Amino acid sequence: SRIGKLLGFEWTDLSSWRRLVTLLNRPTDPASLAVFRFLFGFLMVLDIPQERGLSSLDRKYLDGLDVCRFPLLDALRPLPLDWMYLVYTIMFLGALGMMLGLCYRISCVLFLLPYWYVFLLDKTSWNNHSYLYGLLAFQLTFMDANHYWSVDGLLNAHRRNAHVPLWNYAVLRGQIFIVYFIAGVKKLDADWVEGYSMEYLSRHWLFSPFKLLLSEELTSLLVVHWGGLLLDLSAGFLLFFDVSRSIGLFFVSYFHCMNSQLFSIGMFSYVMLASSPLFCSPEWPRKLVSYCPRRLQQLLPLKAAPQPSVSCVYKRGQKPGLRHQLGAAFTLLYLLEQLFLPYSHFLTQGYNNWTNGLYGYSWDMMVHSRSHQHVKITYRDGRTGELGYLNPGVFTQSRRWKDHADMLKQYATCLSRLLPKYNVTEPQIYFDIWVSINDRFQQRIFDPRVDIVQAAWSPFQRTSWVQPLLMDLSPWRAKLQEIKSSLDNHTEVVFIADFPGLHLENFVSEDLGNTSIQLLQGEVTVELVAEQKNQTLREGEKMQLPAGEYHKVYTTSPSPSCYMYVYVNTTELALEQDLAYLQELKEKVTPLVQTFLRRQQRLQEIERRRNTPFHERFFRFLLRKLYVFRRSFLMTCISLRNLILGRPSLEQLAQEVTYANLRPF
Amino acid sequence: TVFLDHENANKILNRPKRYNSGKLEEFVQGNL
C-alpha cells in the first residue's frame, strides 16, 4: 500500500509475532551492511591508537603509579600494563577482523569485550561517540555483516553475497535515528535553545558564509543552535524517507564534516558519515559496483544478486526458526533500551549531580559546558587533627570528578587510601569546587562542609551533598555578559553565587592589586581575615579588597547571594608598561628584558605557525599521526614480547622504549 | 606537589590554567 512504499513494510506485517518476525528477518541486500561494517572497522582500527589510548597506555596504566581511577564498578580494576597492551591488541585484532569480515563473529567479540572493559574501566573517558562505538560493536556482533565484501565469503560459501535479515538494517538505522533524535531532544534544553551552550563556536572560519548574511550573534543562535537542533531532530526522518533522503544526506554530511573540523571528537563524525548511507537502499554499494566506470569490478566485490541465506525468512510456509525470533526480539528490546537509557536517570539518581546521569549515554553532546573557577581539596588528619590542603586532581588522570558525586566519592576514597602514605591518616576530605555551567554564576557543586570520604553516595539515591544548581539565577546571565563587556583588556571579573550559611575564603594574591567585590544580589558580609574586619554589603555595593591577604565572603542572606570579583592583575599591568618602555627603546634603536625576549619569541612563533603553508601543516599532521601509530605499535610489541618471551634486562627495555618514542622523521 | 599551602589552595581569583569550556565530549589529547 502507500505505507508499504513509504515505510518499507505493511501494517499486516505487524499483526502478530509470526508476521513481525517474518518482516524483521526479511531477506535484504548485504551490501550496505558490509560497507558500514568495513567503514566502522577501519575507523575503530584508526581510533584505537588515537582515542582509546594505545599510544598512551604506558603513561596511563603505568605499574606502581599511585593514581585515582574511576571505574563504573569499583571492583573493576585495570590489568598490568603488559596485559592492558594485550587487551588493546585483542581489541585491534577484533576491529581489523570486523573491517575485513574475517572470523566476523569472533572478531566482533574480540573487539567488543576489550572495548567495553576499557570503557567501564574509566568513567572519565566516556563520550557519546565512544558509547556509540560500543553500541555499534554490540549490534554488529549479532548482525550478518560478513555476507558481503568479506574474507568470510572468500573462505567459505553460504556467506558470500548472501541475504541478511532486514532487522540488521532496522537495528542499525534505529540506533542512528535514536542518536539523532535523542540528541535533538536533549538539545531542546533551554541553554541550547537560547544559544548559551556554544556561543563561541560561530567564531570559527567555517561559519564565514553565514556571517555574510547573519551577524555573529545571529549565526550562533540560528545556525549553531537552532540549525543544529533542527538537524538533529529531523535527521533520522530525512534519512529514512526516500523523497527527502538526498537533502537529508547532504545536510547530515555537512553537519558531520563541520563537526569533524570543529571539535576533537575522534572518529564520531566519520562514523556517522559512514552510517548515513545505512538509510539508503541496502544494494547501493552493489549499484556502485555494477556501474563500474573504470571496469574495475573484478577487484570490487560481487555484483550478482545475493544468494539465499538461512538467516532470513523467505515467504512461500517456511515458519521462522529460533534465530529469527531471537533477531526480532533483539531488535525490539534493543531499540526500546536505546530509547529508554538516555531517560533512565530517574532510576540512577546517584549520578545525577547538575546534569542528570553519567556523561556518555544520553546523547547530550555539547549541550552543557562547564567552567570551573577553583577547586580546594581540604583534608583533616584523623589522628593529629591538623588541617591540610591537597593539589586538586593530584592523583587523577582526568578532571571529570569535579562535576560528579560518584567520581568525587571514588576520588575521596582513593585519596583516603593513598594519603596515609603521605603521613595523613584517616583523612576527612572536603571538596570545595566552583563550577559555572553555560556561563552561569560560579557556584559550589558539592557541599564543602561534608566529608565525602564518609559521605553517603548510592547508585540509586539522590546525593544529599550535591548543591542544587541555582537555576533561578539563570536570567542574570545576560547582565553578567554586559558586565564582562564593560571591562577593559586588563580587567577580569568572576561571578560567584554562594549559598546561605556558606562562606568563600579567598586569598587575593599580591599580584592582584586593585581587586574589588561588588554585591549583585542578596547580602554578603566580607571579613578581612587579616584585619578581622566585618563589612556588610548591600545589593550594588562595591568593596575594595586587600591584595596579599585573606578575606571571607559570608552569604548572610536567607537566599543564595550573587557577587562579582573585579580584579586587574596589576603586576601584569606594570609588566606591560615596562614592556612598552622596552619596545619604545628598541624602536629608537634583566628579568624585564627576559620577559620581553620571551614575548618576542612567542610572537615570532605565532606568526610562523600561521605562515606555514597548508601542505606543511597537513604534512606535520601526517607525521604526528604516523608517530602516534608507530609508538602504539612499538610499545604494543614491547609489551607482547614481555608477556610471551619474558621481560628482558632493564637496559634493553630502556633501549626498546626509547626506540618506540623515537620520532619517525 | 601532592600538598598545597593555605595561601595557594585558597586562591579563587587565580587564573585557571586555560580557558575552561569543557564539553566532556571532545577527547582530551594525552589525558594520561
Ligand SMILES: *[C@@H]1O[C@H](CO)[C@@H](O[C@@H]2O[C@H](CO)[C@@H](O[C@@H]3O[C@H](CO)[C@@H](O)[C@H](O)[C@@H]3O)[C@H](O)[C@H]2NC(C)=O)[C@H](O)[C@H]1NC(C)=O
Ligand atoms: C598577575 O600577573 C603576573 C604577571 O607579572 C602573573 O605572574 C606571571 O605568570 C606567568 C605565567 O602566567 C609566569 O611565567 C612563567 O612562570 C612559570 C613559573 O615560574 C615558569 O614556567 C616560567 O618562569 C614562566 O615565565 C611569570 O613568571 C609570572 N611572574 C611574572 C613577574 O611575570 C600572575 O600569575 C598574575 N596573577 C594572576 C592571579 O593571574
Ligand SMILES: CC(C)=CCC/C(C)=C/CC/C(C)=C/CC/C(C)=C\CC1=C(C)C(=O)c2ccccc2C1=O
Ligand atoms: C537555521 C538554519 C538557517 C539552518 C540551515 C544552515 C545551517 C545554518 C545548517 C546546519 C549546520 C550547523 C551550522 C550544524 C550543527 C553545528 C553543531 C555546532 C553543534 C552540535 C553538535 C556537535 C558539535 C556534534 O559533534 C554532534 C555529533 C553527533 C550528533 C550530534 C552532534 C551535534 O548536535
Ligand SMILES: *[C@@H]1O[C@H](CO)[C@@H](O[C@@H]2O[C@H](CO)[C@@H](O)[C@H](O)[C@H]2NC(C)=O)[C@H](O)[C@H]1NC(C)=O
Ligand atoms: C580598578 O579597576 C577598575 C576596573 O578595571 C577601574 O574602574 C575603572 O574606573 C574608570 C574611572 O573613570 C572608569 O572609566 C572605567 O570604566 C572603570 N572600569 C570598569 C568599571 O571596568 C578602577 O579605576 C581601578 N582602580 C584603580 C585605583 O586604578
Ligand SMILES: *[C@@H]1O[C@H](CO)[C@@H](O[C@@H]2O[C@H](CO)[C@@H](O)[C@H](O)[C@H]2NC(C)=O)[C@H](O)[C@H]1NC(C)=O
Ligand atoms: C563576620 O560575620 C560572620 C557572619 O556574619 C561571622 O561568621 C560567624 O562566626 C561565628 C563565630 O563567632 C560562628 O559561630 C558562625 O558559624 C559564623 N557564621 C557563618 C560561618 O556563617 C564572623 O565570625 C564575623 N567575623 C568578624 C571578625 O566579625
Ligand SMILES: CC(C)CCC[C@@H](C)[C@H]1CC[C@H]2[C@@H]3CC=C4C[C@@H](O)CC[C@]4(C)[C@H]3CC[C@]12C
Ligand atoms: C570485564 C568486563 C567489563 C568485560 C566484559 C564485557 C561486557 C561486560 C560488555 C559486553 C557488551 C556490553 C553491553 C553492550 C551494550 C549495552 C547497551 C547499552 O545501552 C548499555 C550497556 C550495555 C548493556 C553493555 C554492558 C556491558 C557489556 C555486557
